[PDB]
Structures are given as C-alpha cells and as structure tokens.
Amino acid sequence: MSSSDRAMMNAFKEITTMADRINLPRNIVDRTNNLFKQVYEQKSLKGRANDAIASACLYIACRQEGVPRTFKEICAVSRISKKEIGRCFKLILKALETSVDLITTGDFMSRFCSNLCLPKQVQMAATHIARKAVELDLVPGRSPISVAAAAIYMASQASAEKRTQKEIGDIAGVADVTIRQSYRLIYPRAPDLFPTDFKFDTPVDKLPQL
C-alpha cells in the first residue's frame, strides 16, 4: 500500500545499516534521513542509485556536523565508487541548493592518533605542525590528509611512538610515496614547525629522510 516509498524506506534501513558499521551518532543520521527524504521529494534525481545518494547524504551530514569522513572511509561501508559518490554529491548540492565547508586536518588528528593510540601531546603537536604548515602553505598541492599524515609521521618521529610510513599509510590509505613526497615538502621546516611546548625524543637534526 506503499510501493513508491519502498526503495526509500529500504534506503533508510540501509542508511541505518551504513551508520551502524562505524557507530555514528543518531543526530547525524537523522539529518541524513531528512536529507534523503528531501532528495526523494525532489524526484529530479530518481534516475540515480539510492545507495549512492544515501552514501552521499552521509558524507554531507558529517561535513554538516563539521566532522567529515573520507570517501575512502565512506567507500569502506558502501559498494559505490568514490567517483559515483562524488558525482551524486555534486548533484545533491545542485539538487538541494546548499553550500558546504572546507576540510581541516585537525578533525582527523583525533581518530588516527587514536588508532595509533598516540598521546594527546603528540596528537596536539602534529596539529600545530599541520596548522603552521598550512598557514605558510608549505604544501600547496598534496591533500591535507596526506599533509596531516606526514605531520603525524614527523610528530611520531619526534616522539618515542615512531611508526613506519607504511603503517601510517595503511591507516590513512594514502600512498607511501605520497607521504614520502609530502614529508620531503615539510622536512625543510621540520624543526621550526613543531609547537613551542614540545619535548623531543629525537633531535630534528636526527629526523630521518625519505
């Protein structure tokens, strides 16, 4: 007595089943449910796969909550290619006529350093290193996450909690050479990029090269 909504109805179960896999707050999911409902009500994009729209709604809500999750992450929980999510994303921005926000490195300092169980001091040091680097535009090319990971790497390399680039690379998903390149870009200022409130475990002079 409701065939029209049944793909939408199933999409929100699939939205919930997509929010389930990484323990997302319900408020985010609710806006997402509201976002889809809105996108559904337009029907202008009915010629599109529901699961991509759900996944795109999800990427947007995280940004709407000021805590974006990478498409790479969003891909982990969906079958949709990053390309089609990006494509659908654009369509939704056009569909719902609403603006977005730029990403910040510090928003991912928390969980990654957490995933490495790095202490806040390293985590916070990395954030400054990242923050100082972007204010100076030391890396006008590399993705901020790639830039952040190298900062994290540098930071981890400035503490006892050193890790190999491949492990970090594995956690961030970026290429190990991309960090290696991004590192080469930040390395000239490795010493001065650190926060004034820091305690070296290894001299900046003794920071490795790659």
């Binding site: 891909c75 982990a76 290619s81 990053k82 390309k83 995933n115």
Partner: protein
C-alpha cells in the same frame, strides 16, 4: 569366490577367541608396542578355589594389570573379518571376555592427572581478546565491483547482428533436442538484444505460457 561370500571356517572349526577390555592410556602405551608388536607377558595362576590372571608390561613398553573375567552368557559372540583384499572371513567364536583394571597402584590423583593430560585444551572458552580495534580499510571503490571491472572491460553484450542467419541455424540445433525452450535460455545461446531476439522468434515461431506462464518459444509446426 565372491565379495559377499563369508568364510565360515572359524565357526565350523569351533575356533575360540578371548575378549579383553583395556583402558586407553594402556592402549596408548600399546600403540608404542615394543619391537614387532610385543607389549609384555601374561601370567595365569589357577588354584582349587581361586584363579588369577594378569599381564605385565614389557620393560621397553614400561619406558601388573590384573584381568577381570566377564561372562559371555546371554549373547553368543563370534569374530568376523574384512581383509585388505576385502575378502570376508569368520575367525572364531568368543570363548572368553575380560577387563583390564588397576590394582593397588593408584587411588585417584594420577587418574585425575591422566584425564587432565589427555585433554591439554582450553575447552573452547573465550580467553579475552582483551581489547583491539581492527578498523577496516576503505578501498575507494568496492573491491568486488573493481574485480567485476577487470572482467567487465574484457567483453560486452552489445554485439552485432550479422546473423539473420547464423542464429536460425543454431535454432535447428537447440530445437532438435526439445520442441520448446524458455526465453532466457534462448537468450543464453544468443549474444544479441532480447527485443531483436523477440523479432526472430516471432519470425519462425510463436510462443506459449506452456501452462507455466513463462514465455516459452518453439518452432512453427507449419
């Protein structure tokens, strides 16, 4: 001489055999039989009102087991064999049954240890994990979809129609096996759009529900 033929020689010889129950730990000692297979020696003492049988382990096998004799009454027991050449043979009838038991060599502690020793397992209990967070990598595109892609790029179903002839010839081949076929199965032999295929099946045939709803097609009887 036949597979299902059973040799009755033992029975007809009235051949007798002895039956002895033996604990597993001893039997595990016996799988390590000394030499060819010797495990020890059996000692039998009978008196006017008492009979004693026991077995003593081979000195090698060691690196007294009294017997309890049991009745075989109430049920006739015989032994029958299957060779490695699958030939069948009756060796004999059971004239004695017996059980190997401990005597003045253990109370309980060793047996408890023996039971423990046999186990050597965590029973299956969930012994922690303690704590981990094995988060799973985002593959920027669905892996299987990507795997699908390597396959997909190899060939397309969008093929050409140079066949207002090769397909009918193939139709004679299929319909020679059965008068009528399902449309999906007709689609399987073909490499062309169904609508185009629909145009062909209309051309030399008609179709049915065959009393099964399914769009089943067949060649024209006329």
């Amino acid at each position: 001489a036949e597979r299902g033929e059973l040799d009755l020689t033992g029975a007809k010889q009235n051949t007798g055999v002895w039956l002895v129950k033996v604990p597993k730990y001893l039997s595990q000692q016996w799988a390590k039989a000394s030499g060819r297979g010797e495990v020890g020696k059996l000692r039998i003492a009978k008196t006017q009102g008492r009979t004693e049988v026991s077995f003593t382990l081979n000195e090698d096998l060691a690196n007294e087991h009294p017997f309890v004799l049991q009745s075989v009454g109430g049920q006739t027991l015989t032994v029958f064999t299957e060779s490695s050449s699958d030939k069948l043979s009756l060796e004999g009838i059971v004239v004695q049954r017996a059980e190997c038991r401990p005597a003045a060599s253990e109370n309980y502690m060793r047996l408890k240890r023996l039971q423990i020793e046999e186990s050597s397992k965590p029973v299956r209990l969930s012994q922690q994990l303690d704590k981990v967070v094995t988060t799973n990598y985002k593959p920027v595109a669905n892996h299987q979809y990507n795997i699908e892609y390597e396959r997909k790029k190899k060939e397309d179903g969008k093929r050409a129609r140079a066949d207002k002839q090769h397909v009918l010839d193939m139709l004679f081949s299929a319909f020679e096996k059965h008068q009528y076929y399902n449309l999906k199965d007709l689609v399987d032999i073909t490499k062309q759009p169904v609508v185009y295929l629909k145009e062909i099946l209309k051309e030399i045939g008609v179709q049915n529900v065959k009393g099964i709803h399914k769009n089943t097609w067949e060649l024209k009887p006329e």
